[PDB]
């Protein structure tokens, strides 16, 4: 249950007032919020975030958009939260996302897909370390932990 | 193209069960743009033409009668992939097969009371839109959120 | 009488901000019956007539221009006390004075972008309904829930 | 349309304030509520309810947890309600449950999966008879029945 | 915080699928559910429930309607729950009820006002005793009690 | 419209999973999020934040509780946001709060009233400066600003 993942509301998600909605879905699921911030990514930060896509033709547009305004960065904790977080978000391409998921309910275009979630335990650890300083994470015990976990 | 359009209807059961606002909200929340909207009472002949492809099916008479038994809300929605995407929002035709999160998955039980309709293709959408709406009844406008919803 | 009617509009800001479904849902949830619905683009002259009582006010030109700047959704709702009750659902005219739970209390900040309109009396409702809707555009039907909502 | 199923909010679901939410989803779907009660299962009741799983390694924990606090028992009536009720709940193991379902939206751990639904017409009849006395079930007609059923 | 009140969803509220919604609002507020049942009031029970209105001209209609189909009876526990429960319901006459309340959001007619709440500590105790047997109430501790109460 | 206020989800609000809900209400209203973070107040921080109430008999309990676990701090921007933010929260004492407001919907006890909002333009400026560093606030333009403001 101490697994952690990085979830972000992308600039489109902030602009379209989906921050609270996204946070609510993670809270409702049983996951625990241990880091939260609002920040405007720099271009260098955007380049790193999208580094796997550096050779794609839409990279420069993605990097520019991701650094064009604020995101909300989050760290969530819970059993299977990396994979579970992504299930909440829905398929990467909103054409594939199902209703009930964040992208299924709210997104149409793969380049404006509202949010991001780490794709593995390892990439989660890297992303958390990239976006948050040690002193910015909060460790606490949910009063509901024994209701959510056996 | 983001200028694709589809026809969505709330069927008489959906109107009677107060699902009009809920259905509209889901389409708005998705990012689709409302360009036509009206409340109307279909005639039996209108229902027959709308469902003409299904004239030989055993449920046709019942469908036609029910569709014309009270008001529907007709809508035209605009957006990238909206024909296919609209139907995904509605859920499987038979509510037994619809998933929670979809309109039929959340709100319907019986295939003959499945709350709503969506065009099944670009071509049938164009026909349905022209059938239910006059040219002057559609409204062209630009969503202030278009650049937040679409990359181009 | 339960056959009282009022005109409610989602103003251009309400349409742009995706509040059409939300507003309709609140009226459906309350028990009111939808008997007219359309999306339309008011003209400046239509906006001037609709707000004619306010011609001398300093905000009139701005109001008229804004009301005609993009689509509205016009509605006719039917029910006991619906004129007064509809306005209660909308909340105080100036959103600074609107309470949470109302449409303006939950969703609006500025009196000039207050999301919606409702007729202020039985008489002005009748005038507004006749102004925005033709006779053939209203739909008369019976809600299957009328005896659950009304004692008589 | 007179098929019936037994649905329970398990002790974790009651503790986490999901009773209203779960009822709402069944009402919204078109199913009819014909029995409803809050009760504290005994250990012996839990054992019988789960008797088919007596040999499974999680049985003792399940039986103990199911009897650890109040549940809300329900009987719902409608066409295909046994199978349809389970679709609303979502897969048994929340790791497999999809967003939009009760367990997909609200649960993380298979041992804290919020709710129960009968798995067949036959087991539904048994469970209903087990949890409810005849006088606790109400026969009535929904004024919306012709809007929900052809 | 051990104050208790009787809340009912009237037959109109059940018929119009407002049970879950009403329960959710009480759960969300922080109140604790200690009794719940679905039942069809008898005519004699309706007469007692409306006894203060015996001389009013609409009494016989009220008594008939209240005994025409199921209600959901509830007992809720919490600090100030009698008065607080009524605030959630809204003013008795829906013409006076404010949006945000149950009647403000969902009712139009004073004779079809969806729900009932006890009007005092004393009338609560009487109503609870009238609608529930001792063995039907469940005493339990919400895992959230220290989050809701100082 | 550039007025700003400080809003906090108090430790009880975070524990009870009301962060998303509270953010959603502010987003829905039309206010703009310009600062957001999760943090654990220290006792000294709580004391300074509530310094005007040092002589009141509940002070020591308030200071201790406010520093007992994480809060979510927020800065919101908009016309009349200081006064308007407080209207969204509801009266200080939940007994007085109306349904529709955060405390009206979710709180029972004045010592567990879920959230905080600055009480004036001047106290807002102080609180913002106290909880947020300059680099933690983001200056951006909502694409919806002309739809919300005349
Ligand atoms: O063909 C593509 C593929 C990806 N993306 C964007 O690039 C992001 C990161 O791509 P990745 O393959 O990492 O998807 P994710 O990990 O977000 O599912 C996605 O979320 C998309 O917004 C895009 O615009 N076009
Ligand atoms: O066995 C069936 C199949 C379909 N329908 C109804 O006929 C409509 C049109 O059927 P179609 O195959 O066009 O499905 P849709 O395009 O609505 O998914 C459906 O929406 C159903 O309401 C029915 O009553 N019985
Ligand atoms: O000082 C004002 C008063 C009113 N209005 C606008 O004018 C409309 C009509 O004003 P009226 O007094 O008719 O209020 P309503 O009937 O809409 O409550 C309102 O809805 C506002 O949008 C404005 O912009 N400034
Ligand atoms: O590996 C498992 C499988 C099941 N269960 C629990 O045992 C219950 C009954 O199992 P069953 O196969 O009957 O699932 P259900 O009928 O609830 O879908 C489930 O709901 C779970 O709470 C568990 O703790 N571990
Ligand atoms: O003029 C009236 C007054 C009351 N009632 C009904 O009688 C119930 C009980 O009346 P009471 O004065 O006890 O109101 P409550 O205690 O429910 O607020 C109300 O909830 C109404 O539904 C009515 O039909 N007409
Ligand atoms: O009798 C009281 C009054 C206030 N408070 C707490 O002290 C906080 C600050 O009091 P203030 O008068 O500043 O209220 P606020 O500014 O939060 O409305 C409140 O929010 C309550 O949590 C309390 O515990 N008991
Ligand atoms: Mg990725
Ligand atoms: Mg078809
Ligand atoms: Mg007016
Ligand atoms: Mg089973
Ligand atoms: Mg009374
Ligand atoms: Mg203060």
Tab-separated table of C-alpha atoms in Angstrom, chain D:
chain	number	residue	atom	x	y	z
D	1	UNK	CA	-39.043	-8.006	-14.677
D	2	UNK	CA	-39.999	-9.617	-11.306
D	3	UNK	CA	-36.522	-11.174	-10.904
D	4	UNK	CA	-34.957	-10.212	-7.563
D	5	UNK	CA	-31.449	-10.032	-6.150
D	6	UNK	CA	-29.808	-9.454	-2.776
D	7	UNK	CA	-27.298	-6.575	-2.649
D	8	UNK	CA	-25.382	-5.642	0.508
D	9	UNK	CA	-23.219	-2.691	1.431
D	10	UNK	CA	-20.439	-4.460	3.387
D	11	UNK	CA	-19.101	-3.021	6.655
D	12	UNK	CA	-16.409	-1.026	4.853
D	13	UNK	CA	-19.000	0.512	2.542
D	14	UNK	CA	-21.158	1.598	5.506
D	15	UNK	CA	-18.124	2.958	7.392
D	16	UNK	CA	-17.006	4.919	4.314
D	17	UNK	CA	-20.437	6.488	3.754
D	18	UNK	CA	-21.251	4.752	0.475
D	19	UNK	CA	-24.806	3.575	1.334
D	20	UNK	CA	-26.612	6.478	-0.349
D	21	UNK	CA	-24.318	6.389	-3.371
D	22	UNK	CA	-24.882	2.656	-3.894
D	23	UNK	CA	-28.683	2.951	-3.525
D	24	UNK	CA	-28.719	5.907	-5.969
D	25	UNK	CA	-26.995	3.874	-8.652
D	26	UNK	CA	-29.585	1.099	-8.438
D	27	UNK	CA	-32.485	3.632	-8.399
D	28	UNK	CA	-30.944	5.455	-11.348
D	29	UNK	CA	-30.674	2.208	-13.332
D	30	UNK	CA	-34.391	1.556	-13.071
D	31	UNK	CA	-34.372	-1.231	-10.495
D	32	UNK	CA	-37.008	-1.295	-7.774
D	33	UNK	CA	-36.223	-1.409	-4.062
D	34	UNK	CA	-38.373	-4.009	-2.319
D	35	UNK	CA	-36.363	-4.654	0.871
D	36	UNK	CA	-33.935	-2.523	2.841
D	37	UNK	CA	-32.415	-2.775	6.260
D	38	UNK	CA	-29.441	-2.017	8.420
D	39	UNK	CA	-28.247	-4.954	10.471
D	40	UNK	CA	-25.216	-6.347	12.202
D	41	UNK	CA	-24.401	-9.786	10.839
D	42	UNK	CA	-23.351	-12.451	13.322
D	43	UNK	CA	-20.315	-14.596	12.659
D	44	UNK	CA	-22.563	-17.616	12.104
D	45	UNK	CA	-24.626	-15.685	9.583
D	46	UNK	CA	-21.452	-14.669	7.679
D	47	UNK	CA	-20.261	-18.276	7.657
D	48	UNK	CA	-23.533	-19.532	6.120
D	49	UNK	CA	-23.749	-16.697	3.602
D	50	UNK	CA	-20.251	-17.600	2.388
D	51	UNK	CA	-20.527	-21.361	3.016
D	52	UNK	CA	-19.447	-22.315	-0.558
D	53	UNK	CA	-16.091	-20.620	0.194
D	54	UNK	CA	-15.433	-22.523	3.500
D	55	UNK	CA	-12.266	-24.184	2.195
D	56	UNK	CA	-10.723	-21.005	0.727
D	57	UNK	CA	-7.777	-19.461	2.617
D	58	UNK	CA	-9.449	-16.031	3.013
D	59	UNK	CA	-12.667	-17.503	4.537
D	60	UNK	CA	-11.956	-16.925	8.187
D	61	UNK	CA	-10.922	-13.278	7.503
D	62	UNK	CA	-14.000	-12.704	5.320
D	63	UNK	CA	-16.388	-14.171	7.881
D	64	UNK	CA	-14.850	-12.130	10.678
D	65	UNK	CA	-14.866	-8.885	8.674
D	66	UNK	CA	-18.396	-9.298	7.337
D	67	UNK	CA	-19.624	-9.646	10.936
D	68	UNK	CA	-17.438	-6.853	12.373
D	69	UNK	CA	-20.019	-4.056	11.939
D	70	UNK	CA	-23.304	-3.109	10.280
D	71	UNK	CA	-24.232	-3.882	6.694
D	72	UNK	CA	-27.101	-2.541	4.660
D	73	UNK	CA	-29.061	-5.391	3.092
D	74	UNK	CA	-31.218	-4.722	0.041
D	75	UNK	CA	-33.521	-6.597	-2.294
D	76	UNK	CA	-33.862	-5.153	-5.796
D	77	UNK	CA	-36.348	-6.148	-8.412
D	78	UNK	CA	-36.106	-5.901	-12.195
D	79	UNK	CA	-35.407	-7.568	-15.530
D	80	UNK	CA	-31.989	-9.214	-15.397
D	81	UNK	CA	-31.324	-7.619	-11.978
D	82	UNK	CA	-29.091	-10.417	-10.684
D	83	UNK	CA	-26.579	-10.082	-13.542
D	84	UNK	CA	-27.250	-6.340	-13.944
D	85	UNK	CA	-26.704	-5.656	-10.230
D	86	UNK	CA	-23.293	-7.298	-10.413
D	87	UNK	CA	-22.370	-5.198	-13.438
D	88	UNK	CA	-23.157	-2.090	-11.370
D	89	UNK	CA	-20.910	-3.355	-8.546
D	90	UNK	CA	-18.002	-4.149	-10.848
D	91	UNK	CA	-15.535	-7.050	-10.853
D	92	UNK	CA	-15.046	-8.783	-7.462
D	93	UNK	CA	-11.443	-7.794	-7.206
D	94	UNK	CA	-11.251	-4.016	-7.449
D	95	UNK	CA	-7.965	-4.331	-9.405
D	96	UNK	CA	-10.139	-5.648	-12.247
D	97	UNK	CA	-13.104	-3.249	-11.731
D	98	UNK	CA	-13.675	-0.479	-14.232
D	99	UNK	CA	-14.377	3.171	-13.451
D	100	UNK	CA	-18.055	3.803	-13.533
D	101	UNK	CA	-18.745	0.790	-11.343
D	102	UNK	CA	-19.044	0.936	-7.542
D	103	UNK	CA	-15.803	-1.009	-6.928
D	104	UNK	CA	-14.076	0.714	-9.850
D	105	UNK	CA	-14.856	4.144	-8.383
D	106	UNK	CA	-14.472	3.412	-4.674
D	107	UNK	CA	-12.470	0.245	-3.837
D	108	UNK	CA	-8.851	-0.890	-3.917
D	109	UNK	CA	-8.552	-4.196	-2.026
D	110	UNK	CA	-10.479	-7.453	-2.681
D	111	UNK	CA	-10.968	-7.894	1.087
D	112	UNK	CA	-12.472	-4.394	1.321
D	113	UNK	CA	-14.589	-4.399	-1.815
D	114	UNK	CA	-17.475	-2.389	-0.373
D	115	UNK	CA	-20.472	-4.486	-1.481
D	116	UNK	CA	-21.945	-7.908	-2.319
D	117	UNK	CA	-24.401	-9.093	-4.965
D	118	UNK	CA	-26.011	-12.511	-5.477
D	119	UNK	CA	-24.342	-14.444	-8.299
D	120	UNK	CA	-27.382	-16.292	-9.749
D	121	UNK	CA	-31.170	-16.416	-9.687
D	122	UNK	CA	-30.931	-19.478	-7.422
D	123	UNK	CA	-28.380	-18.010	-4.998
D	124	UNK	CA	-30.370	-14.720	-4.996
D	125	UNK	CA	-33.496	-16.590	-3.863
D	126	UNK	CA	-31.526	-18.301	-1.096
D	127	UNK	CA	-29.834	-15.072	0.061
D	128	UNK	CA	-33.040	-13.108	0.057
D	129	UNK	CA	-34.760	-15.825	2.134
D	130	UNK	CA	-31.770	-15.933	4.468
D	131	UNK	CA	-31.503	-12.182	5.213
D	132	UNK	CA	-35.107	-11.040	4.987
D	133	UNK	CA	-38.310	-12.237	6.534
D	134	UNK	CA	-41.352	-12.249	4.229
D	135	UNK	CA	-42.929	-9.269	6.041
D	136	UNK	CA	-39.853	-7.177	5.470
D	137	UNK	CA	-40.292	-7.268	1.674
D	138	UNK	CA	-42.708	-4.796	0.127
D	139	UNK	CA	-44.784	-5.525	-2.989
D	140	UNK	CA	-45.545	-2.284	-4.860
D	141	UNK	CA	-45.725	-0.902	-8.339
D	142	UNK	CA	-43.343	1.795	-9.556
D	143	UNK	CA	-45.216	4.569	-11.280
D	144	UNK	CA	-42.326	4.508	-13.824
D	145	UNK	CA	-42.574	0.805	-14.767
D	146	UNK	CA	-43.994	1.444	-18.290
D	147	UNK	CA	-41.204	3.968	-18.925
D	148	UNK	CA	-38.488	1.440	-17.949
D	149	UNK	CA	-40.016	-1.699	-19.542
D	150	UNK	CA	-41.541	-2.528	-22.828
